[PDB]
RNA sequence: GAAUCUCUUUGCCUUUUGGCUUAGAUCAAGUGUAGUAUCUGUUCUUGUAACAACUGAAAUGACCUAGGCUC
């Protein structure tokens, strides 16, 4: 768990990273929702592909 | 030209979500397993007369400085 929480932390750092934002707090949500997403297809072996994404 | 108000569109907006794990597990079972705790009614509970004695209690309020008499 602990693991795992770090690994979002990380991701939502590299993200903050990235490029401006404003009131991001409400994003970082909405990311770590995409991750978690991305994480269970990956166990399913689905294609995680989203075109919003950027 | 300037002040303001009303409506529509675009931008900005929760055109929708704050974790992880074996999609967390299962839509099944004479269950097994461990523990923790005590109950039924039926009964006990002298009169009459005379003499000696008192004629009356309690409540709160009217006087005086809890106490003392009167109503």
Known sequence: ???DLEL???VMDD???M???SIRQKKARTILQHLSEAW???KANIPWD???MP
């Open 8 to 10: 979002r932390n990380s």
């Open 1 to 3: 768990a602990y693991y």
């Open 19 to 21: 490029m401006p934002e």
């Open 15 to 17: 993200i903050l990273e």
């Open 50 to 52: 989203v075109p919003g």
């Open 40 to 42: 269970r297809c990956w």
